Design a protein around this ligand. Structure first.
Ligand SMILES: CC[C@@H]1Cc2cc(O)ccc2C2=C1c1ccc(O)cc1C[C@H]2CC
Length: 232
């Protein structure tokens, strides 16, 4: 009964890690970002772990879920920090970027555009903090081929996702607005998610031709952290 709305929303509230800090030239940027990314991915795993039922899922599912959503989760987190600061992407209190500034990294601009844009749409939608938290967990749990041995784990996963989805519904209900407005809102929140998903996809295929030269691929960084903090 811990996967009840009120409980869950509170759990996510407390499970939220504190923003990482980082003092602030093509490569030099990738440096600071990669450095932050690594620092956030660690927190992400703790965050995941603190979600009701996650560590009870099969180890396979844990790795698969985290491997498949880190980009999107990082993106969602970026936008929320930079939701109230138009034209800017607040990677960290110190490190902040301007639209034009994005022209620095090879075509990272498209990602920047898509992001800055969607951030705006969320701002307009006046995204609430609790709405944000539920939506985030959804991404972790939602983002094909199922092995017989994984059957039970799958079954559970379905529940966690349903619960979090219900919690979001609940959070929207307490917003006070009319019933049909709740419907409309939920639909909207999900529409925008599809964008973030599309953006994070671009970002991946982007790294599928990344200048691995003066930086370390975040991939390798994650695969290592997983062996460290999820297997071991
Ligand atoms: C909007 C940048 C995106 C998401 C993000 C959020 C964050 O808080 C820290 C790092 C990142 C990275 C991204 C990204 C976007 C496109 C890529 O091909 C690779 C990456 C990896 C890192 C930047 C080192």
């Amino acid at each position: 009964d811990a996967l009840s709305p009120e409980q869950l929303v509170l759990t996510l509230l407390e499970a939220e890690p504190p923003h990482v800090l980082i003092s602030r030239t093509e490569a030099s940027m990738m440096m600071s970002l990669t450095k932050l990314a690594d620092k956030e991915l660690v927190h992400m795993i703790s965050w995941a772990k603190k979600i009701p039922g996650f560590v009870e899922l099969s180890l396979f599912d844990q790795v698969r879920l985290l491997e498949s959503c880190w980009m999107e989760v990082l993106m969602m987190g970026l936008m929320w920090r930079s939701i109230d600061h138009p034209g800017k992407l607040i990677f960290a209190p110190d490190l902040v970027l301007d639209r034009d500034e994005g022209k620095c990294v090879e075509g990272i601009l498209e990602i920047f555009d898509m992001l800055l844009a969607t951030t705006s749409r969320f701002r307009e939608l006046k995204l609430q903090h609790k709405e944000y938290l539920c939506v985030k967990a959804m991404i972790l749990l939602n983002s094909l081929v199922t092995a017989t041995q994984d059957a039970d784990s799958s079954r559970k996963l379905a529940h966690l996702l349903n619960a979090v989805t219900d919690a979001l519904v609940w959070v929207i209900a307490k917003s006070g607005i009319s019933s049909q407005q709740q419907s409309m809102r939920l639909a909207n929140l999900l529409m925008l998610l599809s964008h973030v998903r599309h953006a994070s996809n671009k970002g991946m295929e982007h790294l599928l031709n990344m200048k691995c030269k003066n930086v370390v691929p975040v991939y390798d960084l994650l695969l290592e952290m997983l062996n460290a903090h999820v297997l071991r």
